[PDB]
C-alpha cells in the first residue's frame, strides 16, 4: 500500500485532529460538480453529520434513495506546528468510492466503501491557516467492485441502486475522519505472530517504515511495565510467563515501535495487542491450543437514523448485549467494520471472523472484480491483522456452479490473503449444499432450513432435509470444523401465535431449537453464529418488512423472546 | 462568571482538542472514590462512550438505574506548543453535578447538569505529555438544585432517583468534551443586540476580555466580506442593506473580535450571528417588526441508547422532521440543550424558547433560588448571541403563590434581565387560577387528556373555553403561547371510534385544541407536547416513557404529524 493503515494516535511525534461534526454536503444528480469547481467549495450545501450514512436524515424519497455522485466539504485549521510533518487526511471509509480534494487540489481516489482512505496532503496543506477538504463520493453499484449490484436508470435519468445483497445501500462518510501529522520517517506497518512456549511466549514481528533508521521494539504489559525489548525491523520478543489473551478474558500488552537516529527517537507507534494463537486441528478450532466453540452472531453496522454511521454507543450497547447472551464471537457481515469494533473486541475478548465485502452477495468484468476483491482483501488484512480478536478471514461465497475459472479466481484471493497475513490465520467462506472447500481451513454454512426451505408447517421436513445435508457432509469426512454463520427467521417483535407461525416470536424460538438439535448431532460442528444480532435495514420490497427482521434483538437493541434461548444455551 | 461560556474555536490564538470517545468509567456505590485515590485513576473501570448518557448501555437494572457517585476518566496528549497558555477542560455539561480533577488535582466543581463546565488546568497541565482527567459525577436529585427530586434509599443502601419531573434521570457526560488553549489575554464574553433602521441595521455590542489591550470588532457577511468594523470593547457596527435573519430563512453574519497589541493580534474570536429583532407588541410577537405565530414543539434531548447524548445525526433528523411539519419553533424543554442545537437552529432559521431546568417540575428554598439564578445566568450568557433564541422560559407558577414565591421569581427575572444584553422576552408556565414579570404567558394544558379525556372530550373543550374566556376577560394584553398539549399515543394503536392512546384520538384531540386556540386573538403560538416519544421513569402511567410524541422515538411520524403539517403549511 502507498499509505499506512495504522490507526491514528497522538504523541510527541504524531498528531491528530478530528474532522467529525457537521460537514457541508450537496447532491450532484447532474454530475456537474467537477466542471463547476465544487472541489473549491460547494455552491449550495446543506449540513451533513459525519460520521453517518446520509440516507435516513431526509424526509423525501429521492434524497433517501439518492444514487450517484454527491459531495462533502469541511474546513479545518491546521496548527502551524504541523509544518514539516507528513500531513494526511484519514477517512475511516468513503462509501463507496470517492476522490479527495484538499485546498482545491486532487489528492487521491479510492474504491471500496468499508476500509480506510488515506490522502497525503503534505504538499498542499497550509499550516497555520484554515484548510479545506472536499470529497466527491459515488454510491453506485456495479459488477467490478464490492459489494456488487447494478444501477437502474429511471426514465427521467434518476438513478436507483439495485443491490445484489440484502442490506440497504447506505453511503457517505460513515466513519470518523481525521487530519493527522506524522514524522517524515514513520512506522508505516507492522505485523506480529505468536508462538506459545510453555509458560512463555514469542512475539515474532516485522516493521515497515518510510526510512532506513534503526527500529527498536518494546513490549509493555497491561500496567506499562517493560517485558521485552529488541532491535531491528524483524525480530522476536521473548515474553516470560506470558499472560495470554483468552476468549472473553482478554489481556492486552502494548507494543511500542520506535524509530531512532543518533540523536533520539524519530517516531513512536504504540498499539495494544494480545498474545494468542489460533489453529485448526482436525475438526477443532484451537485458541491457545484449546478447542473453542464459536457462539454469537453475524452483525451489521446498522442503527436507527445513523445508518452505518459509527458511534461508540452502538459498540457499547452491542457488546453488553453480546455478553448478556454469553456469546464469544461475531462475524463482520458483510464488510470490514469500523476499526473501533475490533479494538473493543480485543478488550472484551471477543473472537471476530473478519469479512471482505464479497461474501454477502447473492464479458471482461471478472478480472476487474478480482482486482477489487484482492485489493479489499489486502487492505482488510493489513488493517486488521494485529487485533488478537481477529481469528479468521471470511473471503468468498461459493458459486452454485464452480468453473475452473471461478476456482482460479478464488485461489488468487486466498493466495493474496495468505501473502498479506503474517499470521496465516484460518481462512474461510460460505459454502453451497452438499471444489473450493480445499481453499478453506474451516467451512462456513449459511442455512435456512425452516425459513426459506420447508418453513412453518413443513419444519419437520426442514429438519429432515437439514439432517440429510449434514449426513452428506458427515460422509464426506472432510475433517474440518463447520461453523454455521447464518440461520434465522424473520421475526416481528410482538407477533405472538400459538401454535407459532413464521414471523412470530415463538417460531423464532422453535426454529432455533430445531437448528440446535441438528448442530448438536454432528461432532464436526464447531460454531454457531446466528443471523442476525439485530434487525437491520434492507432495500424495500415485498419480502422485507422495514428491513430484515431476523434479528434476535430489535434494531434499537432490545431482545426478542429468542434472545433468551441463546443466552441459556450459550451459558 | 469566573470563566468563558464561548464555544471553542481553533485558530492561530486558540487551540482545541476533542476528548470525545471511549472513556474509563466506574460506579461508586459506596462513595469511596475520593477516599481511595480515584482522582488519580479508576481502579477497575469499564469503557463508557462520551458523549452519552450511561444508563441504556447496560443490561442490568442496577446499572441502568444507578443513582449516586460515579466516575469518568480519560487520558490525552497535550501538544507541547500549548505551554504557558490558558488551558481549560471544557465539558458541554456534567450531569448533574461533579468535580473535575486533572493530573490528580482538584480543579473545579459545578452543580447543574445542562450547561458547560469550565475547568482551568493552566497550572496543572503537562504540555508535551500525557495528561489525565478524572471526573467525579453525581446524579442524585434534591430540592436545592434543578431539576428537583428526591433520592430514595432501598434497605439495601442502593439509591434510586425519584424525579419530580416527567423525564428519565439520564446522566453522565452527555455532551462533547474538549481541552482547549487560550491566549493569556483573551475574549471572555461578548454580547450583541440589534436595531433595524429602514434597509440598514445596527449591531450594538459589548466585549469582555481578560486584559486591557485594545479591541477591534469586525462583521463579515455570509461570504466573509467585511461589512463593518469598529474599535472598542463597546460599540456599534453599522450594516448597510442588512440581510436580516428571518424565520425559516436564516442569514448569518460572522462577528470577529480581535484583541490587538501594537501591530499584532493577541486573540481572535469568531462566531456566526443573525441580525434580527424580537419584540412583543400587545398580544403579538414580532420578528423583525412582523408578527410571527409560533408553530412547533417541546422537544427533549432523547434518543434510543444514547439517552441525552449529543449527536449531530439526531439534530439533522429532528430538523428535517421539524421542517417537514412546517414548524418554526421549539422550546428546549426542560433544560438548556447542547449548544449545537442552537447553532443549527441559527442556520435553519428556527425560533427557540430557551428553558432553564426549573420549568419542568410537577430552608432549602434559598439554596434552590441560588441554583435557579446560577442556571439562568449560565444559560443566558451561553445562549444570548444565537439569533434563534427569542425567549427565555424561566419558571413554573406555583399553585398557591406566596409573597415569598413572588420575591423568589422576582430575583430570577432580575438575574435574567441583568444577563440578557438583548432583554428579549421572558416567560414561564401559568396556572389555572406573576404576569408583570413575564413578557408573554405560556400555558401547558391537557383538556382532553388529563382532564375530561375520551368520552368527555366535549366537556374538556367547554372547560378549556371557560378558562380561555377567563383569560380573555382579564384583558392582560399579552401574547399567549401554548407550550404543551398532547395525548399519549401508541404507534399502531388504531380504534374506530377513537380511544385515548390511539392514533385517531391524538388527531381528534389536536383538532379540538386548534378549534379552541383559534377562538382567541391573543393566542400567538402553539408548541405541541412532544416532538417525539421520550424516556421517563417507569411507572403505571408510562408505557416505555412518554408517548405524547407526534413522532416515535426513532423519529417517524404518527398519524397526527400530518395534522400539524397541514395546519402549519
Ligand atoms: C445463503 C443466505 C445468504 N444470507 C445473506 C444475508 O446477507 C441475508 O440477510 C440473509 C437473509 O436473511 O436472507 C441470507
Ligand atoms: C405543566 C407541565 C406539565 N407537563 C410537563 C411535561 O414534562 C410532561 O411530560 C407533561 C406530561 O406529558 O404529563 C406534563
From TrEMBL, chain A:
Family: Belongs to the glycosyl hydrolase 2 family.
Protein name: Beta-glucuronidase
Species in which this protein is naturally found: Mediterraneibacter gnavus (Ruminococcus gnavus)
One BP annotation, GO: carbohydrate metabolic process
Occurrences of domain Glycosyl hydrolases family 2 sugar binding (ranges): 16-183
Coiled coil ranges: none
Signal peptide per UniProt: none
PANTHER family with a match to the protein in the record: BETA-GLUCURONIDASE
Its EC number(s): 3.2.1.31
InterPro entries membership: Beta-gal/glucu_dom_sf, Galactose-bd-like_sf, GH, Glyco_hydro_2, Glyco_hydro_2_cat, Glyco_hydro_2_CS, Glyco_hydro_2_N, Ig-like_fold
Gene: uidA
NCBIfam families documented for this protein: PRK10150.1
Residues annotated as binding beta-D-glucuronate: 166, 334, 397-398, 452, 486, 531, 544, 548, 550
Hydrolase listed as a keyword: yes
Domain Glycoside hydrolase family 2 catalytic: 278-571
Keyword vocabulary terms for this entry: Glycosidase, Hydrolase
Domain Glycoside hydrolase family 2 immunoglobulin-like beta-sandwich span(s) in chain numbering: 190-276
First-level EC class: hydrolase
Pfam families hit by this protein: Glyco_hydro_2 (PF00703), Glyco_hydro_2_C (PF02836), Glyco_hydro_2_N (PF02837)
One of the record's GO molecular function terms: beta-glucuronidase activity
TrEMBL record, chain B:
Keyword terms: Glycosidase, Hydrolase
NCBIfam families on file: PRK10150.1 (NF007538)
Protein name: Beta-glucuronidase
Glycosyl hydrolases family 2 sugar binding domain boundaries: 16-183
Domain Glycoside hydrolase family 2 immunoglobulin-like beta-sandwich as annotated: residue spans: 190-276
Enzyme Commission code(s) on record: 3.2.1.31
Every Glycoside hydrolase family 2 catalytic domain range: 278-569
GO biological process, one term: glucuronoside catabolic process
Molecular function as annotated in GO: beta-glucuronidase activity; carbohydrate binding
The organism's taxonomic lineage, starting at the top: Bacteria, Bacillati, Bacillota, Clostridia, Lachnospirales
Family matches, as InterPro entries: Beta-gal/glucu_dom_sf, Galactose-bd-like_sf, GH, Glyco_hydro_2, Glyco_hydro_2_cat, Glyco_hydro_2_CS, Glyco_hydro_2_N, Ig-like_fold
Highest rank taxon of the organism: Bacteria
Record-annotated membrane-spanning stretches: none
PROSITE patterns the UniProt entry points to: GLYCOSYL_HYDROL_F2_1
Family of this protein: Belongs to the glycosyl hydrolase 2 family.
Signal sequence range: none
Residues bound to beta-D-glucuronate: 166, 334, 396-397, 450, 484, 529, 542, 546, 548
Amino acid at each position: 500500500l502507498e499509505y499506512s493503515e495504522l490507526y491514528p494516535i497522538q504523541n510527541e511525534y504524531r498528531m491528530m485532529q478530528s474532522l467529525d461534526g457537521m460537514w457541508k454536503f450537496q447532491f450532484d444528480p447532474e454530475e456537474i460538480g467537477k466542471k463547476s469547481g465544487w472541489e473549491n467549495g460547494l455552491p449550495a450545501p446543506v449540513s451533513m453529520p459525519v460520521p453517518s450514512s446520509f440516507a435516513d436524515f431526509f424526509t423525501d424519497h429521492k434524497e433517501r434513495d439518492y444514487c450517484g455522485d454527491f459531495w462533502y466539504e469541511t474546513e479545518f485549521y491546521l496548527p502551524a506546528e504541523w509544518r514539516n510533518k507528513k500531513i494526511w487526511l484519514r477517512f475511516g471509509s468513503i462509501t463507496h468510492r470517492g476522490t479527495v480534494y484538499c485546498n482545491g487540489m486532487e489528492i487521491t481516489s479510492h474504491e471500496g466503501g468499508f476500509l480506510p482512505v488515506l490522502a497525503d496532503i503534505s504538499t498542499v496543506a497550509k499550516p497555520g491557516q484554515v484548510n479545506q477538504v472536499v470529497v466527491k463520493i459515488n454510491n453506485e453499484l456495479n459488477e467490478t467492485s464490492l459489494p456488487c449490484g447494478a444501477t437502474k436508470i429511471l426514465n427521467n435519468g434518476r438513478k436507483l441502486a439495485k443491490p445484489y445483497f440484502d442490506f440497504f445501500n447506505y453511503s457517505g462518510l460513515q466513519r470518523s475522519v481525521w487530519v493527522i501529522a506524522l514524522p517524515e520517517e514513520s512506522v508505516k506497518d507492522y505485523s506480529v505472530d505468536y508462538e506459545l512456549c510453555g509458560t512463555d511466549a514469542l512475539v515474532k514481528y516485522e516493521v515497515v517504515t518510510t526510512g532506513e533508521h534503526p527500529v527498536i521494539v518494546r513490549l509493555l504489559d497491561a500496567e506499562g511495565e517493560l517485558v521485552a525489548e529488541t532491535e531491528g525491523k524483524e525480530g522476536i520478543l521473548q515474553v516470560a510467563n506470558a499472560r495470554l489473551w483468552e476468549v472473553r478474558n482478554a489481556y492486552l500488552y502494548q507494543i511500542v515501535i520506535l524509530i531512532t537516529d543518533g540523536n533520539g527517537v524519530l517516531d513512536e507507534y504504540r498499539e495494544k495487542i494480545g498474545i494468542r494463537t489460533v489453529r485448526i486441528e482436525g475438526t477443532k478450532i484451537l485458541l491457545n491450543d484449546r478447542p473453542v466453540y464459536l457462539k454469537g452472531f453475524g452483525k451489521h453496522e446498522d442503527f436507527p437514523i445513523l445508518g452505518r454511521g459509527f458511534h461508540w454507543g452502538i459498540v457499547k450497547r452491542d457488546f453488553e448485549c453480546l455478553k448478556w447472551t454469553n456469546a464469544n464471537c461475531f462475524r463482520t457481515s458483510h464488510y470490514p467494520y469500523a476499526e473501533e469494533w475490533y479494538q473493543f473486541a480485543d478488550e472484551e475478548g471477543f473472537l471476530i471472523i473478519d469479512e471482505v465485502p464479497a461474501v454477502g452477495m447473492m464479458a471482461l468484468t471478472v478480472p476487474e472484480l478480482l482486482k477489487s476483491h484482492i485489493a479489499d482483501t489486502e487492505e482488510m488484512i493489513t488493517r486488521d491483522k494485529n487485533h488478537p480478536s481477529v481469528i479468521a478471514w471470511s473471503l468468498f461465497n461459493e458459486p452454485e456452479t464452480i468453473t475452473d475459472y471461478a476456482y482460479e479466481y478464488f485461489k488468487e484471493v486466498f493466495a493474496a490473503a495468505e501473502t498479506y497475513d503474517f499470521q496465516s490465520r484460518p481462512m474461510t467462506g460460505a459454502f453451497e449444499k452438499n471444489k473450493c472447500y480445499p481453499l478453506c481451513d474451516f467451512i462456513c454454512l449459511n442455512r435456512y432450513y425452516g425459513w426459506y426451505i420447508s418453513g412453518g408447517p413443513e419444519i419437520e421436513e426442514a429438519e429432515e432435509l437439514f439432517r440429510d445435508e449434514m449426513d452428506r457432509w458427515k460422509a464426506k469426512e472432510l475433517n474440518v470444523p463447520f461453523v454455521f454463520t447464518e440461520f434465522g427467521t424473520d421475526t416481528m417483535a410482538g407477533l405472538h401465535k400459538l401454535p407459532s407461525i413464521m414471523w412470530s416470536e415463538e417460531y423464532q424460538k422453535e426454529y432455533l431449537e430445531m437448528n440446535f438439535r441438528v448442530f448438536d448431532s454432528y461432532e464436526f460442528v464447531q460454531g454457531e453464529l446466528a443471523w442476525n444480532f439485530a434487525d437491520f435495514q434492507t432495500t424495500e420490497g415485498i419480502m422485507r418488512v422495514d428491513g430484515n427482521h431476523k434479528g434476535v434483538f430489535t434494531r434499537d437493541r432490545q431482545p426478542k423472546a429468542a434472545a433468551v434461548v441463546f443466552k441459556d444455551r450459550w451459558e
